[PDB]
Every structure is written in structure tokens, then in C-alpha cells.
Scaffold this active site. Structure first.
Site: not given
Ligand SMILES: O=c1[nH]c2ccc(Cl)cc2c(N[C@@H]2CN3CCC2CC3)c1-c1nc2ccccc2[nH]1
Length: 269
Positions: A38, A17-21, A126
Site C-alpha cells: 500500500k 483502489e483504497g485506501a484512497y489509492g 468498513d
Molecule cells: O492482497 C492484498 N492485500 C492487501 C493488504 C492490505 C490492504 Cl490495505 C489492501 C490489500 C489488497 N488490496 C485491496 C483490495 N481492493 C483493491 C485494492 C485494495 C483496496 C480494495 C490486496 C489485493 N490483492 C489483490 C489481488 C487481485 C486484485 C486486487 C487485489 N488487492
């Protein structure tokens, strides 16, 4: 050899997922601490240096934490606090929501961080469940700031005018006003997340009068969904947050003095 190997972070499970991937998971090679990484491109900036500049400001346990970034040329490796619990998004049963107490808990911690960010004059812009994360102990952590921006600086506030976020969450004045205060918009988005947390469905598609749903709400026709699913106390709270006029809306300082926000509900451990 003050090291050795420690700064070797292995790429693995794709958080996605975001941002964008994409944000990846990163076990460390030596100690295997887990980190959120990221992945961004040269194809941004300078919007990146902004995210990274803000991300270097955040210091709260309800806000995802920054460590650093490797340049690797036109690919930036963002090192960010890891949460295992995943998205708050995935804790909301569809059409159901969740246990009022769990919801109230999550909401405090959201208010927690949002007060904090506003503290240091920043707006996330957001707020939604896909963006609210949970660590191992189910502690809410606000993540992703590629969209957050400075609204106060040297005591002086700036009115925003850029339209951004996500339609179903974005507040009304974002759709009807040239300029607006940054803080009231984050409260609405937070209120919306409360609805989804207590209803498991979203109230409307955009805060446009053009939306049957939005108009009914401003009609007070709260026998319709979702407000129908919502108990009276918190529904008294959403009636103060989801207030169309951003100048008449509830402020986080007062949200802290709401009956339901201060009604006992959940036990720990
Ligand atoms: O732990 C995280 N820390 C982040 C710190 C900064 C950003 Cl931009 C994203 C995450 C981030 N993902 C966003 C949360 N979501 C998915 C990817 C990203 C954008 C929307 C996670 C995360 N931890 C997870 C544990 C299990 C499953 C997903 C997870 N994502």
C-alpha cells in the site's frame, strides 16, 4: 552478502483502489514472493501510524498479514499479505449472488476473522466485499485497517462515535446515535455482505427509515428483493443480524449457533 538482493521488491501490477489509492503488487527480485504494498503519503499521519500500529497486531489466516513498512520520506511503503484471488466483491454475480454453500463458506471465514479481531479488541469498521480478499485457495482475508480502531483496551470497552465505513453497509445506529458499541456494527456490516453474497444486490442505500427499502425490511415485506432471492434458512439469519436495535441484534457467538450457519452445504477440494 548475507542477502544478496532479497529485499529488492519489484513494483508491478497495480492492485489499485483504497485506501484512497494505491496498493501495488510486489514480486520479489530474488525469490519473487508476492506482496501487497500500500502506497501512502505525507499530505495522514498520524492516522497512518495507527493503521500500521494495528496492522502489527493482526495474526490470523483470515486477516491480511503485516510484514513491515519502509519510510522513504513522505511516502510509506506498506508491506502486506498478498491474495491472488482478488476481491470477494468480484465473486458476486450481479442480481444473482453465488452458490449458497460458497456463500456460507466465505461467511464462516468472515465470522472467523471478525471474532478474532474483536478478540484482540479491534473493529474494522468498513466490512464490505471490496475489502474482503481471497488467496489462491479462495480463503477469505480481511484487508485494510486504515479505518479499524481500538474499542477495547485493558478489558474496558470504548463506545465509538465517529461515523465511517460505507453507507450501504453501515448499520443504523451509526445514523441515529451519538455513541454506539463497536461490535454490533461489524456484525450488521457482515450480515449485509451475506445478503450481497446470496442476492447479488444490496438491500438499501442507507439504514435510514427514510429509505423505502429499509422500511419494507423492518416491515417484514420479504417478498420484495433481495430477501425474495434468499432461501429461508439464511434469511432467518439475516433477520437476526439486520436487527435495527444494536442491543437486540444477534451476537457472533450466537451466529455460530444458527441453523443455516450450521447446515451442511459445501465440500472441499
Ligand atoms: O492482497 C492484498 N492485500 C492487501 C493488504 C492490505 C490492504 Cl490495505 C489492501 C490489500 C489488497 N488490496 C485491496 C483490495 N481492493 C483493491 C485494492 C485494495 C483496496 C480494495 C490486496 C489485493 N490483492 C489483490 C489481488 C487481485 C486484485 C486486487 C487485489 N488487492
Amino acid at each position: 552478502m548475507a542477502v544478496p538482493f532479497v529485499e529488492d521488491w519489484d513494483l508491478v501490477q497495480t492492485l489499485g483502489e483504497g485506501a484512497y489509492g494505491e496498493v501495488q503488487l510486489a514480486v520479489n527480485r530474488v525469490t519473487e514472493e508476492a506482496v501487497a504494498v500500500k502506497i501512502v503519503d505525507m499530505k495522514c499521519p498520524e492516522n497512518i501510524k495507527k493503521e500500521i500500529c494495528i496492522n502489527k497486531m493482526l495474526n490470523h489466516e483470515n486477516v491480511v498479514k503485516f510484514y513491515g513498512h519502509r519510510r522513504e520520506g513522505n511516502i510509506q511503503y506498506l508491506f502486506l499479505e498478498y491474495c491472488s484471488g482478488g476481491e470477494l466483491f468480484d465473486r458476486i454475480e450481479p442480481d444473482i449472488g453465488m452458490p449458497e454453500p460458497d456463500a456460507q463458506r466465505f461467511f464462516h471465514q468472515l465470522m472467523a476473522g471478525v471474532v478474532y479481531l474483536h478478540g484482540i479488541g479491534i473493529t474494522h469498521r468498513d466490512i464490505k466485499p471490496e475489502n474482503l480478499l481471497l488467496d489462491e485457495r479462495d480463503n477469505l482475508k480481511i484487508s485494510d485497517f486504515g479505518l479499524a480502531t481500538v474499542f477495547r483496551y485493558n478489558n474496558r470497552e470504548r463506545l465509538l462515535n465517529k461515523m465511517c465505513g460505507t453507507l450501504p453497509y453501515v448499520a443504523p445506529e451509526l445514523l441515529k446515535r451519538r455513541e454506539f458499541h463497536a461490535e454490533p456494527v461489524d456484525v450488521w456490516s457482515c450480515g449485509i455482505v451475506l445478503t450481497a453474497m446470496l442476492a447479488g444486490e444490496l438491500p438499501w442505500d442507507q439504514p435510514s427509515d427514510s429509505c423505502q427499502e429499509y422500511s419494507d425490511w423492518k416491515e417484514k415485506k420479504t417478498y420484495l428483493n433481495p430477501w425474495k432471492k434468499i432461501d429461508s434458512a439464511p434469511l432467518a439469519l439475516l433477520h437476526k443480524i439486520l436487527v435495527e436495535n444494536p442491543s437486540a441484534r444477534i451476537t457472533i457467538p450466537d451466529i455460530k449457533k444458527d441453523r443455516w450457519y450450521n447446515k451442511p452445504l459445501k465440500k472441499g477440494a
